[PDB]
Paper text:
Additional catalytic steps are acylation at the 6- and 6′-positions of SL1278 with two multiple methyl-branched (hydroxy) phthioceranoic acids, most likely through membrane-associated Chp1 to produce fully elaborated SL-1. These multiple methyl-branched (hydroxy) phthioceranoic acids are synthesized by polyketide synthase 2 (Pks2) using an activated fatty acid starter unit provided by fatty acyl AMP ligase FadD23. FAALs use a carboxylate substrate and ATP to form acyl-AMP.
Next, we solved the 1.5 Å crystal structure of M. tb FadD23 N-terminal domain. The N-terminal structure was compared with that of the complex with ATP or AMP-PNP, and the RMSDs were observed to be 0.4265 and 0.3836 Å, respectively. No obvious changes in substrate binding sites were observed. At the same time, after analyzing the structure, no extra differential density was observed, indicating that the N-terminus of FadD23 could not capture fatty acids from the same expression system. We inferred that the C-terminal domain serves as a cover for fatty acid binding to FadD23 and is important for the function of FadD23. The protein of the M. tb FadD23 N-terminal domain has no fatty AMP-ligase activity.
Numbering used by the authors: 4 to 130, 138 to 153, 159 to 171, 177 to 463
């Protein structure tokens, strides 16, 4: 039913199984691991929940301003355990990033701020609500109020996407069914999650923090700076024992192919990697090819690479490639694409695009954004999305909610709901029964 309840079940079933392992490379370029079992992380979460209840009531917002690490995870889970609506943000980094933080805090109006003692002095100016240094609590002392609906707000004029447990669970059902379709929607026994994505991004939170609990497997986590410093670390950590499930944007596939150092890869066997999602940015076929052409020499399988389309307003996932096959690439004439039409062209020529199966859940339609009517196959329009993973709106923003989540189709085709539809702002088309993403409709 909810993340707190599923964490409790993880403890009941496998209290001594390793849940989260965080690798810090600041003090040793080989990495220092710190791990928690399910029982350890649950205890820490209960201790955070007890603290936050002293400051905030059920349904209040709890902003999280903490560096990447285990304290972030227990702050987020502890907020949920106490029935608070968590608001995951980044540590204060300066510049625009700090004015984003200030604007989110004024929008979400939190009654508690969860942080760490190391950055406490940087956090206090950014927030009167009590500020709790999570690492200074007695997190491992021996020791519910959760909601069943709204879990957290995902910001990314600040508009906080309201994400419910129903949204999360529906999106995980959709993801597990699509990613693992070739094994009957059953993940392998030795799956593990590996992520360096920041927890204040949708994919980093959903994969790094939520998925271990919902799927019931351990996670191996590090920070984005550790990856950027030495990109081979991503491959080293995915090559740990078991079948890794990871994710990154297109730029990081390119950077790893271009900058991972061969000697850091010596002896790695990438042939057990289950899935590497490529998502949150337009997926470039040329980048996927450079990545697989290099890392197939270490046994990476091309069917492990899964382009993934989505957005925070849909929790995270909308569509992905067919399980058990490498990405399908199709080619289209560029002059016609600029004119709004998809015209196939010879393999390799024109514009290469990833071809996605139309998802069975959620559903996708290509819609003319000025007439609210579905486009014929081949005509470019806005991608509209419908399904139980689609959020119910932006926090305390009725008007922006109507504009973004209130799409309504004129004369919908058979089997297509009138609405409400999430208007993604993304442009795309359907061609030969496959789905394609081009860009943004504003363009």
């Amino acid at each position: 039913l909810s993340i707190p309840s599923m964490l409790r079940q993880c403890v009941n079933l496998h209290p001594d199984g390793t849940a989260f392992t965080y690798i810090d490379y600041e003090r040793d370029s080989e990495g220092i691991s710190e791990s928690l079992t399910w029982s350890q992380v649950y205890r820490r979460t209960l201790n955070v929940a007890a603290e936050v209840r002293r400051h905030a009531a059920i349904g209040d917002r709890a902003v999280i301003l903490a560096p990447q690490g285990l304290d972030y995870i227990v702050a987020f889970l502890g907020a949920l355990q106490a029935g608070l609506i968590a608001v995951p943000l980044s540590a204060p980094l300066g510049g625009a990033s700090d004015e984003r933080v200030d604007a989110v805090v004024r929008d979400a109006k939190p009654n508690v701020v969860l942080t760490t003692s190391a950055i406490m002095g940087d956090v206090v100016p950014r927030v009167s609500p009590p500020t709790v240094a999570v690492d200074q609590l007695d997190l491992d002392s021996p020791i519910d109020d959760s909601l069943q609906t709204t879990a957290y707000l995902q910001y990314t004029t600040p508009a906080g996407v309201m994400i419910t447990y129903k949204n999360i669970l529906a999106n995980f059902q959709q993801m597990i069914s699509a990613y693992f379709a070739d094994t009957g929607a059953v993940p392998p026994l030795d799956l593990f999650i590996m992520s360096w994505l920041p927890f204040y991004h949708d994919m980093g939170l959903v994969l790094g923090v939520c998925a271990p609990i919902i799927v019931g497997c351990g996670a191996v986590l590090t920070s984005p700076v550790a990856f950027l410093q030495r990109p081979a670390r991503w491959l080293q950590l995915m090559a740990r024992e078991g079948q890794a499930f990871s994710a990154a944007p297109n730029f990081a596939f390119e950077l790893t192919a271009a900058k991972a150092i061969d000697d850091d890869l010596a002896g790695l066997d990438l042939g057990r990697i289950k899935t590497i999602l490529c998502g949150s940015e337009r997926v470039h076929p040329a980048t996927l090819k450079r990545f697989v052409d290099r890392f197939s020499r270490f046994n990476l399988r091309e069917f492990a690479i899964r382009p993934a389309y989505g957005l925070a307003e849909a929790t995270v996932y909308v569509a992905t490639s067919q399980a058990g096959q490498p990405p399908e690439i199709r080619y289209f004439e560029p002059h016609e694409l600029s004119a709004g039409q998809a015209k196939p062209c010879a393999t390799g020529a024109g514009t290469a695009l990833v071809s996605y199966p139309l998802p069975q859940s959620p559903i996708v339609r290509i819609v003319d954004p000025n007439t609210n009517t579905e486009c014929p196959p081949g005509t470019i329009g806005e991608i509209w999305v419908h399904g139980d993973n689609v959020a119910g709106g932006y926090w305390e923003k009725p008007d922006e909610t109507e504009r973004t989540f209130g799409g309504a189709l004129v004369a919908p085709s058979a089997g297509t709901p009138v609405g409400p539809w999430l208007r993604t702002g993304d442009s795309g088309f359907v061609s030969e029964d496959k789905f394609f993403i081009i860009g943004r409709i504003k363009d």
